[PDB]
Coordinates of C-alpha atoms and ligand atoms in Angstrom, one line a residue:
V2 CA 0.0 -0.1 0.0
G3 CA 1.2 3.6 -0.6
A4 CA 0.7 7.0 -2.5
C5 CA -0.1 7.4 -6.2
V6 CA 2.9 9.4 -7.6
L7 CA 0.2 11.3 -10.1
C8 CA -2.7 12.0 -7.6
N9 CA -1.2 11.0 -4.1
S10 CA -4.6 9.3 -3.9
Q11 CA -3.9 6.2 -1.3
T12 CA -3.7 2.9 -3.5
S13 CA -3.0 -1.0 -3.0
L14 CA -1.6 -1.1 -6.6
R15 CA 2.0 -0.8 -8.1
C16 CA 2.7 -1.1 -12.0
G17 CA 4.8 -4.3 -12.2
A18 CA 6.2 -3.6 -15.8
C19 CA 7.5 -0.2 -14.3
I20 CA 11.2 -0.9 -13.2
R21 CA 10.6 1.2 -10.0
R22 CA 6.8 -0.3 -9.3
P23 CA 5.3 3.1 -8.5
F24 CA 2.1 3.0 -6.4
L25 CA -0.6 4.0 -8.7
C26 CA -4.5 4.8 -7.9
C27 CA -7.3 2.8 -9.5
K28 CA -7.8 5.8 -11.8
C29 CA -4.0 6.3 -12.7
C30 CA -3.0 2.6 -12.6
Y31 CA -5.9 2.0 -15.2
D32 CA -5.1 5.2 -17.3
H33 CA -1.5 3.9 -17.2
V34 CA -2.1 0.2 -18.5
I35 CA -4.6 1.1 -21.4
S36 CA -2.2 3.8 -22.8
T37 CA 1.1 1.9 -22.7
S38 CA 2.4 -1.9 -23.0
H39 CA 2.6 -2.0 -19.0
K40 CA 0.0 -4.6 -18.0
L41 CA 1.5 -6.3 -15.1
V42 CA -0.2 -5.0 -11.7
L43 CA 1.0 -5.6 -8.2
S44 CA -1.2 -5.0 -5.0
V45 CA -0.9 -7.1 -1.7
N46 CA -0.3 -9.7 -4.4
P47 CA 0.4 -9.7 -8.2
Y48 CA -2.7 -9.6 -10.4
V49 CA -1.7 -12.7 -12.4
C50 CA -3.8 -15.8 -13.2
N51 CA -3.7 -18.3 -10.2
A52 CA -4.9 -21.1 -12.5
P53 CA -2.2 -24.1 -12.8
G54 CA 0.4 -23.3 -15.4
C55 CA -1.5 -20.3 -17.0
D56 CA 0.8 -17.3 -18.4
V57 CA -1.9 -14.6 -18.3
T58 CA -0.3 -11.5 -16.5
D59 CA -2.4 -8.8 -18.4
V60 CA -4.8 -7.2 -15.9
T61 CA -7.1 -6.2 -18.8
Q62 CA -7.5 -10.0 -19.4
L63 CA -8.0 -11.0 -15.6
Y64 CA -11.0 -11.4 -13.1
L65 CA -11.4 -11.8 -9.3
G66 CA -13.4 -15.0 -8.8
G67 CA -13.2 -16.1 -4.9
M68 CA -10.3 -14.4 -3.5
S69 CA -8.1 -15.6 -6.4
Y70 CA -7.5 -13.8 -9.8
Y71 CA -8.2 -15.5 -13.2
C72 CA -8.1 -15.0 -17.0
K73 CA -11.4 -15.6 -19.2
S74 CA -10.3 -19.5 -19.5
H75 CA -9.7 -20.3 -15.8
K76 CA -12.3 -17.9 -14.0
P77 CA -15.0 -19.3 -11.7
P78 CA -18.7 -18.5 -12.8
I79 CA -19.0 -15.8 -10.2
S80 CA -16.1 -13.1 -11.0
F81 CA -15.8 -9.5 -11.7
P82 CA -13.0 -8.1 -14.1
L83 CA -9.9 -6.5 -12.3
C84 CA -9.7 -3.8 -14.8
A85 CA -13.0 -2.0 -16.0
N86 CA -15.1 1.4 -15.2
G87 CA -11.8 3.6 -15.9
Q88 CA -10.3 1.9 -12.7
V89 CA -8.1 -1.3 -11.9
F90 CA -9.5 -3.2 -8.8
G91 CA -7.8 -2.9 -5.3
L92 CA -8.1 -1.3 -1.7
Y93 CA -9.2 2.4 -1.4
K94 CA -11.5 2.2 -4.4
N95 CA -13.7 5.2 -3.2
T96 CA -10.6 7.6 -2.5
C97 CA -9.1 8.3 -6.1
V98 CA -8.8 11.5 -8.2
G99 CA -7.0 10.8 -11.4
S100 CA -5.4 13.4 -13.8
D101 CA -6.3 15.4 -17.0
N102 CA -3.1 14.0 -18.7
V103 CA -0.9 10.9 -17.7
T104 CA 1.2 11.4 -20.7
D105 CA 4.4 12.7 -18.9
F106 CA 4.3 9.8 -16.5
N107 CA 3.9 7.1 -19.4
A108 CA 6.9 8.7 -21.3
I109 CA 9.0 8.7 -17.9
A110 CA 7.9 5.0 -17.3
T111 CA 8.8 3.9 -20.8
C112 CA 11.5 6.0 -22.3
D113 CA 15.0 4.2 -22.6
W114 CA 17.0 7.4 -21.5
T115 CA 18.9 7.6 -24.9
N116 CA 17.3 10.8 -26.0
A117 CA 17.9 14.4 -24.5
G118 CA 14.1 15.0 -24.6
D119 CA 13.7 12.2 -22.0
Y120 CA 16.0 14.4 -19.3
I121 CA 14.2 17.6 -20.5
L122 CA 10.8 15.9 -19.4
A123 CA 12.5 14.7 -16.0
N124 CA 13.4 18.2 -15.3
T125 CA 10.0 19.9 -16.4
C126 CA 7.4 17.5 -15.1
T127 CA 5.8 17.8 -11.7
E128 CA 8.1 17.4 -8.8
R129 CA 6.8 14.0 -7.8
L130 CA 7.5 12.9 -11.3
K131 CA 11.0 14.5 -11.1
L132 CA 11.6 11.9 -8.3
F133 CA 9.9 8.9 -10.0
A134 CA 12.0 10.0 -13.3
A135 CA 15.3 10.3 -11.0
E136 CA 14.7 6.7 -9.7
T137 CA 13.5 5.2 -13.1
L138 CA 16.8 6.7 -14.7
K139 CA 19.2 5.8 -12.0
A140 CA 17.8 2.1 -11.8
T141 CA 18.0 2.1 -15.8
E142 CA 21.6 3.3 -15.6
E143 CA 22.6 0.7 -12.8
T144 CA 20.8 -2.3 -14.8
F145 CA 22.7 -1.3 -18.1
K146 CA 25.9 -1.9 -16.3
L147 CA 24.9 -5.6 -15.9
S148 CA 24.4 -5.8 -19.9
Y149 CA 28.1 -5.4 -20.1
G150 CA 30.5 -8.3 -20.3
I151 CA 32.9 -9.5 -17.5
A152 CA 36.5 -8.7 -18.3
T153 CA 38.9 -11.5 -16.9
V154 CA 42.7 -11.3 -16.4
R155 CA 44.0 -13.6 -19.3
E156 CA 47.7 -12.6 -19.0
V157 CA 49.6 -10.2 -16.7
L158 CA 52.2 -8.7 -19.2
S159 CA 53.7 -6.4 -16.8
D160 CA 52.8 -4.1 -13.7
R161 CA 50.1 -1.4 -14.6
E162 CA 49.5 -3.5 -17.9
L163 CA 47.2 -6.6 -18.7
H164 CA 45.7 -8.9 -21.1
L165 CA 41.8 -9.0 -20.7
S166 CA 39.6 -11.9 -22.1
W167 CA 35.9 -10.8 -22.5
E168 CA 32.5 -12.8 -21.9
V169 CA 31.1 -13.3 -25.5
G170 CA 27.6 -12.2 -26.6
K171 CA 27.6 -9.2 -24.2
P172 CA 29.1 -5.7 -25.2
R173 CA 32.3 -4.5 -23.6
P174 CA 32.1 -1.1 -21.7
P175 CA 34.0 1.8 -23.2
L176 CA 37.6 1.9 -21.4
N177 CA 37.6 5.6 -19.9
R178 CA 37.5 6.9 -16.2
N179 CA 33.6 7.4 -16.6
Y180 CA 33.5 3.3 -16.3
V181 CA 35.1 2.2 -12.9
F182 CA 35.3 -1.7 -12.6
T183 CA 35.6 -3.8 -9.4
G184 CA 38.3 -6.6 -9.3
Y185 CA 37.6 -10.2 -7.7
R186 CA 39.8 -13.2 -6.7
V187 CA 38.3 -16.6 -7.4
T188 CA 37.7 -18.3 -4.0
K189 CA 36.7 -21.8 -2.6
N190 CA 33.0 -21.4 -3.2
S191 CA 32.4 -17.5 -4.0
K192 CA 34.5 -14.2 -4.9
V193 CA 36.0 -11.4 -2.8
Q194 CA 36.3 -7.6 -3.6
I195 CA 39.9 -6.5 -4.6
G196 CA 39.4 -2.7 -5.1
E197 CA 37.8 -0.5 -7.8
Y198 CA 39.8 -0.2 -11.0
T199 CA 39.6 1.8 -14.3
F200 CA 41.4 0.9 -17.7
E201 CA 42.6 2.4 -20.9
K202 CA 43.7 0.8 -24.4
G203 CA 47.2 -0.5 -24.6
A208 CA 46.4 -5.4 -23.9
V209 CA 45.1 -2.6 -21.6
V210 CA 46.5 0.0 -19.0
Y211 CA 44.9 -0.3 -15.6
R212 CA 44.8 2.3 -12.6
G213 CA 43.6 0.6 -9.5
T214 CA 42.1 1.9 -6.2
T215 CA 44.8 -0.2 -4.4
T216 CA 48.0 -2.1 -5.4
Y217 CA 48.2 -5.9 -5.7
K218 CA 50.0 -8.6 -7.5
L219 CA 46.7 -9.5 -9.5
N220 CA 47.0 -12.9 -11.1
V221 CA 45.1 -14.6 -14.2
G222 CA 41.5 -15.5 -13.5
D223 CA 40.8 -12.3 -11.6
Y224 CA 37.8 -10.5 -13.3
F225 CA 36.3 -7.1 -13.3
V226 CA 32.7 -5.9 -13.3
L227 CA 31.2 -2.4 -13.1
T228 CA 29.9 -2.7 -9.6
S229 CA 26.1 -1.4 -9.6
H230 CA 24.0 -0.6 -6.4
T231 CA 20.5 -0.6 -5.1
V232 CA 18.6 2.6 -6.0
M233 CA 16.4 3.5 -3.1
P234 CA 13.0 5.2 -3.6
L235 CA 12.9 9.0 -3.2
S236 CA 10.8 11.1 -0.8
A237 CA 12.0 14.5 -0.5
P238 CA 11.6 17.0 -3.4
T239 CA 14.7 18.2 -5.4
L240 CA 14.2 21.8 -3.8
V241 CA 12.4 22.4 -0.5
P242 CA 9.6 25.3 -0.9
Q243 CA 11.5 28.5 -1.3
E244 CA 11.1 31.2 1.6
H245 CA 12.2 34.9 1.5
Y246 CA 12.8 36.5 5.0
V247 CA 13.2 40.3 6.0
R248 CA 15.9 39.6 8.6
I249 CA 18.8 37.1 8.7
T250 CA 17.0 34.1 10.3
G251 CA 18.6 31.5 12.7
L252 CA 22.0 32.9 12.0
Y253 CA 24.2 35.4 14.2
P254 CA 27.0 37.4 11.9
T255 CA 30.4 38.0 13.4
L256 CA 31.2 41.4 14.3
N257 CA 34.8 41.2 13.2
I258 CA 35.5 39.4 9.8
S259 CA 39.0 39.2 7.7
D260 CA 39.4 41.5 4.7
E261 CA 39.8 38.0 3.1
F262 CA 36.1 37.2 3.2
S263 CA 34.7 40.9 3.0
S264 CA 33.8 40.5 -0.6
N265 CA 31.3 38.0 0.3
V266 CA 29.4 39.7 3.4
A267 CA 26.5 41.0 1.3
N268 CA 26.2 37.6 -0.2
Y269 CA 26.5 35.7 3.2
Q270 CA 23.5 37.9 4.1
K271 CA 21.3 37.0 1.3
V272 CA 22.2 33.3 2.3
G273 CA 20.5 34.3 5.8
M274 CA 17.4 35.9 4.3
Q275 CA 16.2 33.1 2.0
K276 CA 15.6 29.2 2.5
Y277 CA 17.9 28.2 -0.2
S278 CA 20.3 30.4 -2.4
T279 CA 22.1 29.7 -5.6
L280 CA 25.9 30.9 -6.1
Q281 CA 27.3 30.5 -9.8
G282 CA 31.0 30.4 -9.3
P283 CA 33.0 30.5 -12.6
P284 CA 36.4 29.2 -12.8
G285 CA 38.8 30.4 -10.1
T286 CA 36.3 32.9 -8.6
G287 CA 36.3 31.5 -5.1
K288 CA 33.7 29.0 -4.6
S289 CA 35.4 26.9 -1.6
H290 CA 36.7 30.3 -0.2
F291 CA 33.0 31.4 -0.2
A292 CA 31.9 28.2 1.4
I293 CA 34.3 28.3 4.3
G294 CA 34.0 32.1 4.6
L295 CA 30.3 31.4 5.4
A296 CA 31.4 29.5 8.8
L297 CA 33.6 32.6 9.8
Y298 CA 30.8 35.0 8.9
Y299 CA 28.2 32.8 11.1
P300 CA 30.6 31.4 13.6
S301 CA 28.1 29.5 15.8
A302 CA 26.3 28.1 12.7
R303 CA 26.4 24.1 12.4
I304 CA 27.4 23.6 8.7
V305 CA 27.1 20.3 6.8
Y306 CA 29.5 20.6 3.5
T307 CA 28.2 18.3 0.9
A308 CA 28.9 17.2 -2.7
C309 CA 28.7 14.4 -5.1
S310 CA 32.4 13.4 -5.6
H311 CA 34.9 12.6 -2.6
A312 CA 37.4 15.0 -4.4
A313 CA 34.8 18.0 -4.1
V314 CA 34.2 17.1 -0.4
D315 CA 38.1 16.9 0.1
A316 CA 38.8 20.2 -1.5
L317 CA 36.1 21.7 0.8
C318 CA 38.1 20.1 3.7
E319 CA 41.4 21.3 2.6
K320 CA 40.1 25.0 2.5
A321 CA 38.6 24.4 5.9
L322 CA 41.9 22.9 7.4
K323 CA 43.3 26.5 6.5
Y324 CA 40.6 28.6 8.2
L325 CA 38.3 26.6 10.7
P326 CA 39.3 24.8 14.2
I327 CA 40.2 21.2 13.2
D328 CA 38.6 20.0 16.5
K329 CA 35.4 21.5 15.3
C330 CA 35.5 19.5 11.9
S331 CA 34.5 15.8 11.0
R332 CA 34.8 13.9 7.7
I333 CA 32.0 11.2 7.3
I334 CA 33.4 8.0 5.6
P335 CA 31.3 4.9 4.9
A336 CA 32.8 1.6 5.9
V340 CA 38.7 5.0 -2.1
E341 CA 41.2 7.1 0.1
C342 CA 39.7 10.4 1.3
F343 CA 40.8 13.5 3.3
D344 CA 42.1 12.0 6.9
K345 CA 42.8 15.1 9.2
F346 CA 39.3 15.3 10.7
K347 CA 37.8 12.9 13.4
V348 CA 36.0 10.5 11.1
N349 CA 32.2 9.8 11.2
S350 CA 31.4 12.5 14.1
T351 CA 27.9 13.6 13.1
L352 CA 27.4 15.9 16.0
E353 CA 30.6 18.0 15.1
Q354 CA 29.8 21.7 14.3
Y355 CA 31.4 21.3 10.8
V356 CA 30.5 18.1 8.7
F357 CA 32.2 17.2 5.3
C358 CA 30.6 14.1 3.7
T359 CA 29.6 13.2 0.2
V360 CA 25.7 13.0 -0.6
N361 CA 25.3 9.2 -0.7
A362 CA 27.1 8.8 2.8
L363 CA 25.0 11.6 4.4
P364 CA 23.5 10.9 8.0
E365 CA 20.1 11.8 9.0
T366 CA 20.6 15.2 10.8
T367 CA 19.8 18.9 11.1
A368 CA 22.1 21.9 10.4
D369 CA 21.9 25.7 10.4
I370 CA 23.5 25.7 6.8
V371 CA 23.9 23.1 4.1
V372 CA 26.5 23.9 1.4
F373 CA 26.0 21.7 -1.5
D374 CA 29.2 22.4 -3.7
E375 CA 29.8 21.4 -7.5
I376 CA 26.1 21.5 -8.2
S377 CA 26.4 21.0 -11.9
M378 CA 27.4 17.6 -11.3
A379 CA 24.3 16.8 -9.2
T380 CA 21.4 14.9 -10.5
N381 CA 17.9 15.4 -9.2
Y382 CA 18.4 11.9 -7.6
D383 CA 21.3 13.6 -5.4
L384 CA 19.1 16.7 -4.9
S385 CA 16.3 14.6 -3.2
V386 CA 18.8 12.5 -1.1
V387 CA 20.2 15.7 0.4
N388 CA 16.7 17.2 1.3
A389 CA 15.7 13.7 2.6
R390 CA 18.9 13.4 4.9
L391 CA 19.4 17.0 6.0
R392 CA 16.7 19.4 7.5
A393 CA 18.4 22.8 7.3
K394 CA 17.4 26.4 8.2
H395 CA 19.2 27.4 5.0
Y396 CA 20.5 25.5 1.9
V397 CA 23.3 27.1 -0.3
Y398 CA 24.0 25.5 -3.7
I399 CA 27.3 26.5 -5.0
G400 CA 28.5 25.4 -8.6
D401 CA 28.6 26.8 -12.2
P402 CA 25.8 25.7 -14.7
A403 CA 28.5 26.7 -17.3
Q404 CA 30.8 23.8 -16.4
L405 CA 30.4 20.1 -16.8
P406 CA 27.4 17.9 -15.7
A407 CA 27.4 14.4 -14.3
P408 CA 27.7 12.0 -17.4
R409 CA 24.6 10.5 -18.7
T410 CA 26.0 7.0 -19.6
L411 CA 22.6 6.4 -21.5
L412 CA 22.4 9.4 -23.6
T413 CA 23.3 9.5 -27.3
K414 CA 20.7 11.6 -29.2
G415 CA 20.3 15.5 -28.5
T416 CA 22.6 17.5 -26.3
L417 CA 21.7 18.2 -22.6
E418 CA 21.3 22.1 -22.1
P419 CA 22.5 23.2 -18.5
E420 CA 18.9 24.3 -17.6
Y421 CA 18.2 20.4 -17.6
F422 CA 21.4 19.3 -15.5
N423 CA 19.2 19.4 -12.5
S424 CA 16.5 21.7 -10.5
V425 CA 19.1 23.8 -9.2
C426 CA 20.9 24.5 -12.5
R427 CA 17.3 24.8 -14.1
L428 CA 16.6 27.9 -11.5
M429 CA 20.2 29.4 -12.3
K430 CA 19.4 29.4 -16.2
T431 CA 15.8 30.4 -16.1
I432 CA 15.4 33.1 -13.2
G433 CA 19.3 33.5 -12.7
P434 CA 21.4 32.8 -9.7
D435 CA 20.9 34.4 -6.3
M436 CA 24.7 35.2 -6.3
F437 CA 27.6 35.5 -8.9
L438 CA 31.2 35.5 -8.2
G439 CA 32.1 38.0 -11.0
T440 CA 36.0 38.2 -10.9
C441 CA 38.2 35.3 -12.2
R442 CA 41.5 35.3 -10.2
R443 CA 43.1 32.4 -12.0
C444 CA 43.2 32.9 -15.7
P445 CA 44.7 35.2 -18.3
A446 CA 42.5 38.2 -19.4
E447 CA 42.3 36.7 -23.0
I448 CA 40.6 33.3 -21.6
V449 CA 38.4 35.4 -19.0
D450 CA 37.2 37.6 -22.0
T451 CA 36.5 34.6 -24.2
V452 CA 34.4 32.5 -21.7
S453 CA 32.7 35.8 -20.3
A454 CA 31.3 36.3 -23.8
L455 CA 31.0 32.4 -24.6
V456 CA 28.8 31.4 -21.4
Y457 CA 28.6 34.3 -18.9
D458 CA 26.7 37.1 -20.7
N459 CA 29.9 39.6 -20.5
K460 CA 29.7 39.5 -16.6
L461 CA 32.9 37.5 -15.8
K462 CA 35.7 40.1 -15.1
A463 CA 39.5 39.4 -15.4
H464 CA 41.8 39.9 -12.1
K465 CA 45.0 39.2 -14.1
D466 CA 46.0 41.0 -17.3
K467 CA 46.4 39.6 -20.6
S468 CA 49.5 37.1 -20.6
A469 CA 50.1 37.5 -24.5
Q470 CA 50.7 33.6 -24.1
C471 CA 47.2 32.6 -25.4
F472 CA 47.6 31.0 -29.0
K473 CA 45.0 29.4 -31.3
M474 CA 45.6 27.4 -34.5
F475 CA 42.8 26.2 -37.1
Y476 CA 43.9 22.6 -37.9
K477 CA 41.6 19.8 -38.8
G478 CA 44.3 17.5 -39.6
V479 CA 43.2 13.8 -39.5
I480 CA 40.6 11.9 -37.4
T481 CA 41.0 8.2 -36.6
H482 CA 38.4 6.4 -34.4
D483 CA 39.0 3.3 -32.2
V484 CA 36.3 1.4 -30.3
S485 CA 34.9 4.3 -28.2
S486 CA 37.4 7.4 -28.6
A487 CA 39.1 9.7 -31.2
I488 CA 42.7 10.5 -32.3
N489 CA 44.0 13.3 -34.3
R490 CA 47.6 12.6 -34.8
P491 CA 48.4 15.5 -36.9
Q492 CA 47.2 17.9 -34.1
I493 CA 49.7 16.3 -31.8
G494 CA 52.3 16.6 -34.6
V495 CA 51.7 20.3 -34.6
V496 CA 51.9 20.5 -30.7
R497 CA 55.2 18.3 -31.1
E498 CA 56.5 21.1 -33.4
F499 CA 55.4 24.1 -31.5
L500 CA 57.2 22.4 -28.4
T501 CA 60.4 22.2 -30.3
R502 CA 60.2 25.9 -30.9
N503 CA 58.8 26.9 -27.6
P504 CA 60.5 24.5 -25.2
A505 CA 59.1 26.4 -22.2
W506 CA 55.8 24.8 -22.9
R507 CA 57.2 21.5 -21.6
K508 CA 55.9 22.3 -18.3
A509 CA 52.4 22.3 -19.9
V510 CA 49.5 20.0 -19.1
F511 CA 48.1 18.2 -22.2
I512 CA 44.1 18.3 -22.3
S513 CA 41.7 16.8 -25.0
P514 CA 38.1 15.7 -25.1
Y515 CA 39.1 12.1 -25.7
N516 CA 41.2 9.6 -23.5
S517 CA 42.5 7.9 -26.8
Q518 CA 44.0 11.4 -28.1
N519 CA 45.2 11.7 -24.6
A520 CA 47.0 8.2 -24.6
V521 CA 48.8 8.9 -28.0
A522 CA 49.8 12.5 -26.8
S523 CA 51.4 11.2 -23.6
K524 CA 53.6 8.6 -25.8
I525 CA 54.6 11.4 -28.3
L526 CA 54.9 14.7 -25.9
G527 CA 55.3 13.2 -22.5
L528 CA 53.2 16.0 -21.1
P529 CA 50.8 15.0 -18.3
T530 CA 47.4 14.4 -19.9
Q531 CA 43.7 15.1 -18.7
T532 CA 40.3 15.0 -20.2
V533 CA 38.4 18.1 -19.9
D534 CA 36.0 16.1 -17.7
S535 CA 39.0 14.9 -15.5
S536 CA 40.6 18.5 -15.5
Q537 CA 37.2 20.1 -13.9
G538 CA 38.4 22.0 -10.5
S539 CA 42.1 21.7 -11.3
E540 CA 44.5 24.5 -12.4
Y541 CA 47.7 24.6 -14.4
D542 CA 50.2 27.5 -15.6
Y543 CA 50.2 26.1 -19.1
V544 CA 47.6 23.9 -21.0
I545 CA 47.8 22.6 -24.6
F546 CA 44.4 21.7 -25.9
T547 CA 43.7 19.7 -29.1
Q548 CA 40.0 19.6 -30.1
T549 CA 40.7 16.5 -31.9
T550 CA 37.2 16.5 -33.6
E551 CA 34.2 18.8 -34.3
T552 CA 31.6 16.7 -32.8
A553 CA 28.8 17.8 -30.4
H554 CA 31.2 16.3 -27.6
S555 CA 34.1 18.2 -28.7
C556 CA 32.2 21.6 -29.4
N557 CA 30.0 21.4 -26.2
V558 CA 30.3 25.0 -24.8
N559 CA 30.4 23.8 -21.3
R560 CA 33.2 21.3 -22.2
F561 CA 35.3 24.1 -24.0
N562 CA 34.6 26.6 -21.0
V563 CA 36.3 24.1 -18.7
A564 CA 39.1 23.1 -21.1
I565 CA 40.5 26.7 -21.6
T566 CA 39.9 28.0 -17.7
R567 CA 42.4 25.3 -16.6
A568 CA 45.2 27.8 -17.6
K569 CA 46.8 30.3 -14.9
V570 CA 49.3 31.7 -17.5
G571 CA 49.1 30.4 -21.2
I572 CA 47.3 28.2 -23.4
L573 CA 47.7 26.7 -26.9
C574 CA 44.3 25.5 -28.5
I575 CA 44.6 23.5 -31.7
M576 CA 41.2 23.8 -32.9
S577 CA 38.9 21.7 -35.4
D578 CA 35.7 23.8 -35.0
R579 CA 35.8 27.1 -37.1
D580 CA 33.1 28.4 -34.8
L581 CA 35.0 28.1 -31.4
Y582 CA 38.3 29.0 -33.0
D583 CA 36.6 32.6 -34.1
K584 CA 35.5 32.9 -30.6
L585 CA 38.8 32.4 -29.0
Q586 CA 40.2 35.8 -28.2
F587 CA 43.8 34.5 -28.6
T588 CA 46.7 35.2 -31.0
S589 CA 46.4 33.2 -34.4
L590 CA 49.2 31.2 -35.2
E591 CA 49.4 29.6 -38.8
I592 CA 50.0 26.0 -39.8
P593 CA 53.7 25.3 -39.7
Ligands
S7J601 N1 53.9 31.8 -36.2 C1 53.4 30.9 -36.8 O1 52.7 31.1 -37.8 C2 53.6 29.6 -36.2 C3 53.6 28.5 -36.9 N2 53.8 27.2 -36.5 C4 54.0 27.0 -35.3 C5 54.0 25.7 -34.8 F1 53.8 24.8 -35.6 F2 55.2 25.3 -34.2 F3 53.2 25.4 -33.7 N3 53.7 28.0 -34.3 C6 53.6 29.3 -34.8
ZN602 ZN1 4.2 0.8 -15.8
ZN603 ZN1 -3.7 8.4 -9.1
ZN604 ZN1 -5.7 -18.6 -16.7

């Protein structure tokens, strides 16, 4: 028994064809089965024919006769159909309201999550459907990992390098950081975990969560997890106040956090507030600063990734009493300078999926662009706070949507919080980039920030751009542009100072060929997000939607403190780079 995700109407029915089995009310259960292919219906039992070896599961073809369910064939003389009168049969028949359109819920219930339009719906539908979609999508995402073949150690060629044999008649996952495996040694009568792993083409290069002497017959699967049902909305109902509420501002603040005193005040006069922090504009400085501005306030610092939480801890370590901090870790190596799993400590740093059930004066959810509505709901479910602050940049990179291949996902669809920042705009904006040369600040300001991002640093005159398509080759799940690397090889012979540069591209295979040929450290744009380097060499590699995504490109070029070379494929983004043009060697 439970609550009809469309009416809320109290019902005894769940759709059995829906992978989440949402409770549906007589009206809504009915309007769902007749308009889709979903016809299995679960109650306190499954509406299936209890006749001996009868296949009939379709609720339209079934009847209650006695207190058992039957098809046309096996039914007793006295029966009524389970599914007529615009209603399916269960408890609470008399309480039931329905809807004018069940269209959105049917599409969420039945979409395969490969098209952008699916994520657009999950973000514009009603809030209760946002939760149902967020569950349905995540469960689809975890199930699709099982579709992938087991990889098995056939040969140990060296250290860091392996020969994999692959389960037959199942697809192989792409071999980039987005796919994290789990090893396993072959035991008496079962299997035991042996760390999480990632892989890259060679054989295969593996970078594992621990070190081992892993031997032949050890095998790797993408560990999937149970997706829980969602209760809390993605955003709580907004409230605006006329005084700061529940928080006591400091009398003396340092001139280091003085630029955020206005903003910290806004944080205190609404229930939840959005901070768009462009690259190197001071998000974590803002987040720790809030503690100093509201010294007595209990603050839970949260984010999706261990790395985002650890970065909030590193900043905290520099400004807040250590004895007042605790890192929550569930029973991967993360920040170990705070007492571990002390829920009652004044400053709690902890990832979304490890959050305890607790209250707080402020919740700071950092790197908000990487959040899904699933994560938004979890936070609201685990943490009851006087104030919620969502820090991020909807111009940076979202969580990867492993399933999505048709359409592009616009930032107003990354999650509820981002949707607000792109539609009404953010409550607050860090408007001065400290990290990057003026030429890169001026470019992204125009590109994705509506000419509101200001350069702290001057021009470096060390920002170059070259229009060179070269030659694209494809391997199994990536791209390579050898001529674009060749051009960098030549630039480096003529500009050897640039040998301190990080190499960035939108493809891990481009990156692998580059590491061999240039010996620069390499990053994918997606793995570079939240890191800074003096000198960046970027090869676009392709002109695909992937390699021209304005958010990817925004993150690529804003990694540079001093200088950047961009070897560009796309004439559009080339022309938007406010950089010195260099001609083809
Ligand atoms: N000044 C130029 O037109 C120019 C040509 N070529 C190069 C290369 F290939 F070394 F990167 N850098 C600059
Ligand atoms: Zn269904
Ligand atoms: Zn209903
Ligand atoms: Zn039957």
